Design a protein around this ligand. Structure first.
Ligand SMILES: OC[C@H]1O[C@H](O[C@H]2O[C@H](CO)[C@@H](O)[C@H](O)[C@H]2O)[C@H](O)[C@@H](O)[C@@H]1O
Ligand SMILES: OC[C@H]1O[C@H](O[C@H]2O[C@H](CO)[C@@H](O)[C@H](O)[C@H]2O)[C@H](O)[C@@H](O)[C@@H]1O
Ligand SMILES: OC[C@H]1O[C@H](O[C@H]2O[C@H](CO)[C@@H](O)[C@H](O)[C@H]2O)[C@H](O)[C@@H](O)[C@@H]1O
Ligand SMILES: OC[C@H]1O[C@H](O[C@H]2O[C@H](CO)[C@@H](O)[C@H](O)[C@H]2O)[C@H](O)[C@@H](O)[C@@H]1O
Lengths: 461, 461, 461, 461
């Protein structure tokens, strides 16, 4: 093809069609302004054409997937095998050979579409866990390409990874890249150890740095670079948006509609068993039972975005969370005044920002999360320096946001102590923490992340 | 003893101590004003004395029960064997011989306490399913006594009753009475058939009337009278109470606190699997899904009084209902505005009356209920002629309250159609129904009921 | 059509094709020898033709049903609504309007096929719970016909029947017959009461006799006869078959293959929650635990024929029973010697007869069963007068087989006592019981049953 | 005290009393023959004395534990927190603060008993996961002691270990030792990484060898040695025992009692969710379904020893396995001939050896296991060179027994392929493998293991 920079991701960067706002596709804009750029992905509709679509800024290459393809490659292998395994088997992975076979077939199709788009010697950046076979497949089709891969979810310890019957194929798949990146040094180090243990490759032994001190894996005549690049957001843009009059007005209206509580706790997540929503609710219930939170002036809002309804584990999770909600309100609410407000629906971005602005305590308590950008978004929104972030240690974000109230979500006693502390912090202490968190997040944005990864990738040439 | 009229019931008519208001004990007041009256029952505290307590109006005879006695006789045999069996095995009865043995032992203890209190030739009125052995035991101890028994819960069909391993002992127990009463002719007729089938007694074959046309069972030289006496409330007293300024003010405040909805649906029940609370919630959810109820101006309040927490079936039921609540609000509510308000706690009587006055639609949808006085209380409160009663056919109340919106709770399509009809009735049609229901309930009160039963019992002399 | 006697049943009397042996179709042979006979039913294959098939003896009229028809009318309405409801709601019936609508549509199709076959003034005999609408539909199409209906499963008490949202339609459906028959007087009496309560018809009030003393329901100008006709088997034929050399040789071989136990208990059932298989296993386990049965010389064989695998309740039941089997053997067996042998597969008739001949104790312990012919078959096979029948009271068979060891399956203590008694009976006492049971079963066979029903039906002319 | 060599373990090496045979206590005999030896442990009876008991060979120091102590420290913290966590969270660990507090209290009690027994400068060897706090506690009480600790179960990856709310306390506890040993280099390397990540200690970075190339952790002025020492059995003694006439006679009798099958598969385990018993049964069922194993001449014997009945996860596991057993026999067995024989009971050692000798295929398929000595015992018993070992990769044993048929138990397709391969191996290939496995196991016995650990520990002086 005629593109010298190519992104490969499970989905095209569109909404159903118009270009989706923000995200990676926006972070890359000033590179696409000087490159012949392409994006390979599934357009989100079954059995579409694979005819290229010019976006002026980008050229989009659609990948044809049937509904059955999506069921077995995506909702099957990706979300019911890889997702739970990589997130510390919070639920039991399902090992299914037909899912594997479709995952291979679909990965090859992405590889073919990439080659079609990629000019000679082009730079290719493959995204995330659905496409781990693509780098090797692409190198075999197109040895002229420079190939980067970034994993957005955690890379699990070897003891868990080894469960995968296709462990070697996945590892070889990733080793097809010139650069393999993870959010955290821990993931990079697991990958190095896996390369030694499973594949028998020679690797570097030193600790892996942050955006520096890269590891290496020797594969025959070529070297694979391994690095840690923690993703972030467009901090400045969110900071700006959150100051808008209409957002501030909505935040005040939210508090009014909640009956003007003294304190609002907020959870914002896709409904996933990795997110520790159940832990927040358990902690809140026990605090109310113990009289350590005031049921008359404190309210918890949980906004759950529907996710993966076709996967049974998610339906069961929804059932447990919805039981907790009903239970806590039945026990501690009053007619016309719940202590927990729970919504299971998509939420417009501007409404979410208004909730960040209204919330006195942000509860981000995943059991395991690659990064978690909701924590960083809350921080970027609080230019008033109000609020408080309660953050699980088991997120990538916890490595950068040390000034937050950090918790081990498995330590329920300390989660409860911490929620009380966040709710009752002095104004000055709250400001001190938020000021420090904002300094970090404003300085370490998605632009820094993307430039760091691409600089590392370019250096493999 | 020195009492010529004696009531026998599982509990003494007290709150923990002071005399409990209303109820049977108040209905009997003008008889106790001309009788030497006694009440036999458990005082609600473990291992108490059995020393008589003069209430001036009554003499109370406490029955000593240990916590283990209560666990096996009451929460065991009474509530986990008899209760589910008599209510059409909505949950599976547990047949446990140790529970049976304690039930016999405790029933004998009540019989002994009764004899202690009862003067020669005294009239005795035994209450309800916990004490079905007492009449026979008492007749053996005291053949001089006139003995009535009234069952407050349904009497099941023979096909289900026969499951009970101690079916014959229970039947003989009831046949010790001079008069056996039920709310409905159906129960009386089941009892007659059971007497023929199981005990081989000669009985009458005709239909049993309401407070008339009594059946009979011949037991050797004596005859057992069998009748239907549908219980009611002190209709006039509730009518009066509901007109009080403070009640009306509270009802307005309730509507204000709910955000001034156009329509309020109300459920008021002890949390029991017989009450069909799950059906109301399912119907409401599907109506919202179908857009047939307006989620912006219609709200459902369910007040569940905690019941029998030590019984596993009740804990599981609570879990399912609380899930439904959380689910429906997550799907159709807004932050600061649920469509379902659910409270799991005891509610003061005056607060309940205020809710009756506020509610546009009363949802009384049991799967099976002896009478259900909540339906009649709602009617007695609506002297403004507003409101609407949606009532399950499977209640004793449905035989008298035919002007209500009657439903088969198993027919979910018709339950949904009926809720829409009740919510959207014309003012005139609503008034027509409520006027007719009030005529019935005001005329057929607890006084009429108690006099009818005691007249029938006296006639056995 | 040209048939003056017509049977209507869910399935044609064939195996897939050849005529199925025994059963109703064989009982009717000497009537078909003097009649122009027809049989209407589904041939058991989806979307077949409805072209008549001459069997010389009979003419078969196939009813076309699609796989979807079978799923909603048969496995849906018939087996997941009616079956559990009529058997005392051992599992919760599912009320589904789409199932109902298909049940109506399919019943009409059977009615149309019947009319096609039936000559003018012909006699029609409709079979069982799948076809309860056919009599009314047929009378409307063909008022010239004489119509009988026999229900092979129990008819439930009114309190349970009334749950059915289409209760009135089913009742009207049955009332289309000139004769409605049940195995037992109890079913007939429930039907009479239902006719009065639900339909408001005038009925007889007397007890219903066995093959006599019929009840009646007045429907406008015509009368519906109601009777009890307990089904049986071809007793003489089974008695004869069980004496065959090869059967006796197989029975000895069975005992040899079980390691020559002193005592064999046997269960033979379709795998259904009505059959009380779980109760047998629980009783056997507790007897072994208590050392009241000798684990070294006593063995229990349970032969479960697979049934209704597409219905979830049956899959769950299979799971529980299979757990019990594994558990009991793990606890009381030895390697090479289980105490329970369990087979989940169809069993050839001649193999079943050999098991009847080998078994010292026959365990027939349904929670609820219309008749249960397995009990009568065991009796007919034991012309050696050996063996012992343990029989649930909750079967139609218990009304005729009073000399068996009768048990209330809910009374587990007595089930256990009874199994010990049967296992250890003296030879003389065993013979006394078996001799008496055989006198009853040899005299009251399927021929007597069929003649009695047809005589009653003919008398409605 | 007066002992210069002291073993510390959860239980005293006795049966209830007499000295228990074999095991660690026998491996140490020639050291105790030249040492003043002591053993500290719970005698297995509640609230005993702590008076020392001379065994001539050893002095036993009993630790007093109440039944409540055992419930919270052992069945609670040890078996419901640590056990599932360290075995890759196959079931969800329970984090309970009261269990933790009792675990600390009990560990201190063991430490106090050790100090009481230990002479000045004595060598102390603490055993296993129940006693991980003891080394630090002991060093604080008795800085004069040389302290070794060996973990017999796996040491989990840091991502899982970090869940533990008392992660730091456990790690500090282990760091109190002069030598920390694990079966495998992987465990040692996890420990080193944990020491760096959690405790911030300086450690060695190199790979850890087998009984060599030790790691180190610097703790202030002292160094902690870290090593891998894979445990084994008394190979020669078992080899000798398995040749006994009575054992060989019993093995032949076992095959006779199974109906002389051509092939016997054997599983021998404590009933634990770590052991992968469910996987064996699933594989066997699918092979039978596929006709790849002959149901007429192949039989699977599973001997499950009862374990931890007071822990709910184990009761649920028992239920699932027992269901599988019942199911497979119901589907593929014949009356008098199951395809699966399952026993849930303790088995005498001599009976187990006879089963090893009889078994054609040994199925050792844990999901995760520290070592698994059953695999090595089978090998030591087969001096006839018959048999075949199917072994999970996820055992310590798989690192030494590479000549076995190794399987990933999560790869069910390959487990099935492998069982077929083992069942149908040529005699020569079977012998080749068994000969090689025996060379390893005969050379690497419990004596080599114990000497290696004690040499390493002595070198810390
Ligand atoms: O499953 C697709 C998900 O991808 C994103 O989340 C992952 O990537 C983020 C950015 O690197 C991380 O913050 C996060 O921890 C990862 O799980 C996306 O944000 C999610 O909405 C998607 O569900
Ligand atoms: O279990 C005790 C219950 O007794 C009452 O309810 C029964 O008696 C009422 C009056 O006859 C009926 O209306 C009702 O249908 C019966 O269940 C009491 O009202 C309940 O609160 C108690 O739970
Ligand atoms: O569901 C069809 C079943 O019909 C028969 O069983 C019923 O009819 C028998 C004869 O009247 C009774 O003995 C029995 O109690 C009824 O359930 C048939 O025998 C069964 O195999 C069928 O499952
Ligand atoms: O829970 C106590 C268990 O300890 C032993 O098992 C562990 O130690 C063995 C020897 O090091 C290993 O083979 C094994 O993998 C470990 O789990 C003992 O053998 C078990 O019976 C005990 O359950």
């Amino acid at each position: 093809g005629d593109s010298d920079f190519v992104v490969v991701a499970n989905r095209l960067p569109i909404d159903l069609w118009k270009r989706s706002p923000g995200g990676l596709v926006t972070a890359l804009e000033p590179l696409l302004r000087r490159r012949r750029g392409a994006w390979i992905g599934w357009p989100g509709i079954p059995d579409s054409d694979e005819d290229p679509i010019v976006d002026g800024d980008l050229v989009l290459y659609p990948v044809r997937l049937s509904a059955d393809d999506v069921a077995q490659y995506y909702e099957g292998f990706s979300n019911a095998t890889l997702w739970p395994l990589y997130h510390d088997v919070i639920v039991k992975p399902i090992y299914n050979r037909q899912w594997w076979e479709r995952y291979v077939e679909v990965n090859r199709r992405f590889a073919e579409a990439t080659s079609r788009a990629a000019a000679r010697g082009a730079t290719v950046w493959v995204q995330d866990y659905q496409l781990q076979l693509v780098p090797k497949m692409l190198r075999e089709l197109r040895p002229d390409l420079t190939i980067g891969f970034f994993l957005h979810i955690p890379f699990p310890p070897v003891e868990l990874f080894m469960q995968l019957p296709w462990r070697t194929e996945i590892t070889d798949g990733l080793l097809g890249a010139d650069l393999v990146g993870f959010h955290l040094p821990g993931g990079a180090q697991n990958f190095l150890f896996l390369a030694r243990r499973l594949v028998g490759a020679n690797t570097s032994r030193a600790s892996v740095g942050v955006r520096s001190k890269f590891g290496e894996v020797q594969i025959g005549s070529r070297t694979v670079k391994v690095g840690a690049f923690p993703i972030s957001i467009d901090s400045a843009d969110l900071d700006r948006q959150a100051r808008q009059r209409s957002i501030r007005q909505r935040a005040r209206q939210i508090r009014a509609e909640l009956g003007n509580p003294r304190r609002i706790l907020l959870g914002v997540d896709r409904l996933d068993y990795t997110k520790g929503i159940d832990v927040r609710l358990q902690a809140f219930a026990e605090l109310l039972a113990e009289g350590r939170v005031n049921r008359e002036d404190t309210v918890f809002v949980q906004l759950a975005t529907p996710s993966r309804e076709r996967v049974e584990a998610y339906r069961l999770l929804r059932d447990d969370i919805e039981r907790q909600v009903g239970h806590i309100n039945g026990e501690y609410g009053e007619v016309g005044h719940p202590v927990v407000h729970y919504l299971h629906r998509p939420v417009p971005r501007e409404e979410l920002i208004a909730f960040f602005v209204a919330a006195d305590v942000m509860l981000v308590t995943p059991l395991r999360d690659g990064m978690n950008l909701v924590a960083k978004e809350y921080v970027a929104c609080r230019s008033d320096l109000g609020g408080a972030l309660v953050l699980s240690e088991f997120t990538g974000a916890a490595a950068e946001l040390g000034q937050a109230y950090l918790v081990n979500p498995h330590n329920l006693d300390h989660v409860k102590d911490t929620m009380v502390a966040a709710l009752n912090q002095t104004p000055e202490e709250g400001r001190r923490r938020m000021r420090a968190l904002r300094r970090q997040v404003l300085a370490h944005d998605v632009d820094l992340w993307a430039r760091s990864f691409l600089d590392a990738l370019a250096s493999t040439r």
